[model samples]
Target: MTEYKLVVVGACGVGKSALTIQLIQNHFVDEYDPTIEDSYRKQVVIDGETCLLDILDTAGQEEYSAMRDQYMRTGEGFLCVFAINNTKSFEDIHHYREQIKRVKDSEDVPMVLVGNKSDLPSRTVDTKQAQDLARSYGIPFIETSAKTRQGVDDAFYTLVREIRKHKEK
Candidate 1:
């Protein structure tokens, strides 16, 4: 089976694990449970193409910052996630992108900027700002709610599409 390593990068409480589990397990929890770099595998079809997706849900805590590169090094595609309710989290995406490029040793790595936790009532960062930053980085932008599963699947599918496109070129 063709397998892709997809990493979910984001700040704490941004719902990276929640987003991943929903995609793989189709279940949700109602509390904050931080992930310590767990991986799950599933068979998925994006745009009628089937592949085994090995997804890594990474840590967002500051101390694990050094380990970020290790995870990024082997990833084929990345989901740069940030909470919509935190502007600071959204602002940290450039660092994540830069880390990926440095670790992967390529500037044209396939990626998508994701704004998660859309179920939160208060949004601190404007969608336009996030979209503009993503545009500047030449990556697709999406917002998701792990609670409602809104845009969660699309975000990952889009990244896979991008990876396929990148491979073609």
Candidate 2:
């Protein structure tokens, strides 16, 4: 089966693990913290193609900051995640975006701009702003809630689709 190496990246407390776990485990985690690194694999069929999704769940803690480049080197696509309620997290997406481009040495890398934690009531990042950012990057943008499983599959699936289009070129 074809395999896609996907990486999840964002600031701390932005629910990176929650989003990854929800997608792989089909369950939500309330208060989970990540260590240095964790990866998950799942076989899925998308667009009539059997494929494997190798998801790297990176640590949001700055202590593990040194290892960011390693995964960015291997990832075929990225899910640039942030929390809607946290404006700082949203701003941090630019760093990840630049870092990924620097590591890959390509501006047209495949990625999905993810605004997670959509289930929360108090929102700080506007959807229009997120959409505009995604537009600037020329990538797809999705809002997700691990608690309600909203837009979870679509985000990852869209990344896979983007990767396919990227590699085809």
Candidate 3:
């Protein structure tokens, strides 16, 4: 089985763990409990490809910077999540992007910028802005809602497809 390490990162309350669960298990945790410094692993098959997805769902706040760096180093891909209703979470992308670059040390690593919480009507960040930010980093971007199961699979599958394409090359 091919193994891939992926990291989900964003500021506090940006739905990183929610997105992770939706992608890996097709489920969502609605309780809104803050992630208590833990990481989980799951396996999923996409298009007949067995992938051991080592998902590092780290804490959102800056308090866990050390752990976040450790996780980023092991990631082959990244799902940088931001809440559509929260501009602060979106702003943290720069920090997250910088950390990924410092740890992974590769410009070619596949990254998917995820704007989560799409079900909310009060979006503080626009799609164009997110797209521009992703463009600046040369990564794909998508808005998702784990509650509605919107774009959840796309976020991770897109990265997986990119990784496969790179492997083929």
Candidate 4:
């Protein structure tokens, strides 16, 4: 099977692990357990093609920022996540997006802009704003609720599709 190196990048408390664990383990984590960095592997079929997804769940804390570029350099695709309820987290996405491009040394790298935590009642970042940013970046955007498992698969699957399309070009 073809292997895809996928990284989840976002500010702290944005549910990067939540979405990843939901995808990998099929469960939601209720606690605020922070991650330094973790690697997970899963085999699945996407678009009728069996694929090995090598997912890297990363740390959002500044202390672990030193290690960000190392994994960013190797990721084939990225899921740029931010919490919908946090405006600052959404704003920080520009840094992550640009940093990924810098590390990858390609402006055309495959990516997905993810607004997580959609299950919450309060939303600081609306769909329109996120959609506009995604349009400006020329990438797909998705809102996911790791709590409810909404759009979790689509976000990752879209990144894989983007990687395939990038390869074709």
TM-score of each: 0.91, 0.94, 0.88, 0.93
Score residue 14 of candidate 3 by CA lDDT: 84
Model 2 root mean square deviation, Cα atoms: 1.8
Q: Which ranges of candidate 2 are over 4 A from the true structure? A: 60-67
What is the TM-score of candidate 3?
0.88
**Pairs of residues clashing in candidate 4:** none
Cα deviation of 79 in candidate 1 (Å)?
0.3
Give the TM-score ranking, best first: 2, 4, 1, 3
RMSD of 3: 2.2
**For model 4, what is the error of residue 26's alpha carbon versus the real structure, in angstroms, after optimal superposition?**
0.5
Question: Per-model C-alpha lDDT, please?
Answer: 0.85, 0.89, 0.81, 0.89
lDDT of 2 at 58: 81
Candidate 3 structure quality by residue, lDDT tens digits, 1-169? 7887777778878888788777767788886568564566677788897887777787746665676566667677888989999999899899888877778777777889999999999699999999999999888998899998899888988888877766751
Candidate 3: lDDT of 164?
78
Model 4 scores worst on lDDT over the 10 consecutive residues at 60-69
Candidate 4 has what TM-score? Answer: 0.93
Q: Higher-lDDT candidate among 2 and 3?
A: 2
